[PDB]
């Protein structure tokens, strides 16, 4: 009952087949330290935008979720760059409902 010029192997049955904290990534590994340069101080007041060196392997969506958890605030956007030096740098802009100024000063800045 073969109907191919060449044989093909049949389907045969196939059976389906320590760190206490495995997820080493974390809100605290993602975000590192806020940046306090005067390009960033222009953004906190003028753009409602916190600046952070953030883990270089972290991505944007993780940086949002990290700001939400570390500083309890929404990030309308987070456009990161990785610095020539190799640190990644997020400019996170806060939702208007969240001041970037009231929050940065709450942050000890």
């Amino acid at each position: 009952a073969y109907t191919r010029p060449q044989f093909r192997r049949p389907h045969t049955y196939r059976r389906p087949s320590m760190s206490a904290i495995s997820n080493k990534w974390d809100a605290f590994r993602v975000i590192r330290y806020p940046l306090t340069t005067d390009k960033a101080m222009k953004k906190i007041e003028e753009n409602n935008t916190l600046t952070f060196i953030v883990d270089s392997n972290a991505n944007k969506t993780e940086i949002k979720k990290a700001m939400r958890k570390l500083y309890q605030v929404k990030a309308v956007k987070v456009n990161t760059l990785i610095r020539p030096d190799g640190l990644k740098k997020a400019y996170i802009r806060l939702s208007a409902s969240y001041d970037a100024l009231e929050t940065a000063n709450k942050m000890g800045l």
């Binding site: 009952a1 073969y2 109907t3 191919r4 010029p5 060449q6 044989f7 192997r9």
Partner: peptide
């Protein structure tokens, strides 16, 4: 309609 080709099929070598 697909007629049997067992006779002219290329079998596995062990066959």
């Amino acid at each position: 309609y697909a007629r049997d080709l067992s006779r002219f099929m290329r079998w596995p070598t062990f066959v």
